[PDB]
Amino acid sequence: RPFRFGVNLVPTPGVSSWRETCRTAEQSGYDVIAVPDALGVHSPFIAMMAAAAVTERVQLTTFVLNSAFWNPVLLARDLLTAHELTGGRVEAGLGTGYVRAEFETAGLDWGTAGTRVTRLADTLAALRTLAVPTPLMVGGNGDRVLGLAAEHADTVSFSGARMITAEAMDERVAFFAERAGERDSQVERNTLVQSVIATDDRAATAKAMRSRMPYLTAEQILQLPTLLIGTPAQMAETLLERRERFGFSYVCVQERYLAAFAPVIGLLG
Amino acid sequence: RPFRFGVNLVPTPGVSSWRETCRTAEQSGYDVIAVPDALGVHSPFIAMMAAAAVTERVQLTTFVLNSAFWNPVLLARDLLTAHELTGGRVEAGLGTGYVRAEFETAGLDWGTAGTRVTRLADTLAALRTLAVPTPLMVGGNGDRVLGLAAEHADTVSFSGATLTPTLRMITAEAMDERVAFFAERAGERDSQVERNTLVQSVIATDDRAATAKAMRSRMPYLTAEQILQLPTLLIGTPAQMAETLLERRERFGFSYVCVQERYLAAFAPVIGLLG
Ligand SMILES: C[C@H](OP(=O)(O)OC[C@@H](O)[C@@H](O)[C@@H](O)Cn1c2nc(=O)[nH]c(=O)c-2cc2ccc(O)cc21)C(=O)N[C@@H](CCC(=O)N[C@@H](CCC(=O)O)C(=O)O)C(=O)O
């Protein structure tokens, strides 16, 4: 699948630069602006509408909704509206929600880990039953969640982080592919790269980073799917290898790396 | 011909930086500011006047006008006005138009490729008959369009990409044929017509070979060697890029080179070296 690149922007209360930041993302060549779903951050669909007003090309996605925060029928109302009123530019990433303090603050039942996955499952089933027009992404590495992505999702998002080894990712991607079966080729695979480390000596940088990861070898650090290290050409070759190995074609980076990663889009976008 | 360097800027509604952007282009050493003709973009001659008020040296050009948008007599009025009220600093690039939704939004007939090219031909003939004082550029790679450039234009702009009326980059070998086609049509007038091309990407790198290899992902129909010869791409250090542009002026005759707004700063070092 052809590469698509996203940047995870955080619309922050009291910060007045939202429109400018979204323009910079589009002008820098990103294909997708992604926003989170958290307390203390701007509301995601409202922020996406403000982004749509100052951009023309990028897709706009949640990355990812906390299923505990949304009533499925009312979420389907939101998604239909966001689709129609942006001209079809909205996608919806969903996940389980993992911060207990946010449930407590909002007066929601934390339940059990399995109850929180069932909330995601029930939401996915309802959104498909209501035929929402927005493409759906499912994120999370748990067995059941990956099964739900295999069943319902247009895009599956794998977490790379406690950074996951390339060998551990092999096992999660293989587990997903077994669940997806004959659907496998119809599901785009996403991951979020947590750090983009520009360096003219990736070998020395990796060896030095054993300071913060003494439990990994330098080769293991250079193979961590959530880290990209080196020059733009090296980073592009790393992403090409990771698309072959893991199937990852939809790659997101964090806001602080927007400019650091942009040269890679010039080679692969 | 001596090199001339342009940057294609997009004057955008709701973005208050137009004057600042135009001054940066001139201060960075560009010879030309180019603006498009599209719905949703600021109106081209009005944006050009705003640019002329804050710059002193650069030429200002359309790059390129959608011929379906303009009545030839009224366009001649605009061109004479722009010429006199800027002191001779305006040039007009013209093309056929190619985005069907813009025709439809403006209530214009998309028609056929034939009718869109005939509209360009009719407009060029009328502008020459009205003796407009602005230099005229004609852009596009179709046989009829390059024939019109050979007949009428002061500058011919060779497109480095095709797209069903997204972009597919054309090889250096195909560009060789397009330049030779134009030259044959131009005949004795060939040497009086400046040749332009737009570079789509300016990629600063210390490993041009590794860069080109990776870029095959975006252009699977090309080899790395072909990527390094694409006229729409500049790859390497500023010195390597300057040497490439010298080689491409000898191979293709390209002396008027434009880059896209995103690469304004990336390309400016090359201007330093070629001057
Ligand atoms: C559409 C284009 O024809 P062209 O003569 O090369 O260019 C015509 C116009 O697009 C051109 O004159 C300009 O108006 C376009 N143009 C702009 N046009 C505008 O209207 N506004 C602009 O601001 C503008 C800017 C601009 C900047 C640079 C540039 O190079 C062109 C620009 C083209 O891609 N032609 C292909 C043919 C494409 C086609 O018809 N079919 C496809 C599919 C084949 C099939 O399925 O049948 C193909 O042959 O590959 C070709 O010659 O090979």
Residue numbers in the entry:
A (entry chain B): 25 to 185, 197 to 304
B (entry chain A): 25 to 189, 195 to 304
From the study:
Central to this pathway is PepI, an F420H2-dependent oxidoreductase. PepI first catalyzes the formation of the central statine, then produces the C-terminal statine moiety. Among these, the homolog kvPepI from Kitasatospora viridis DSM44826, with 53.3% sequence identity to PepI, was more amenable to study. Through comprehensive structural and biochemical characterization of PepI/kvPepI, we confirmed that PepI/kvPepI sequentially reduces the middle β-ketone followed by the C-terminal β-ketone or methyl ketone.
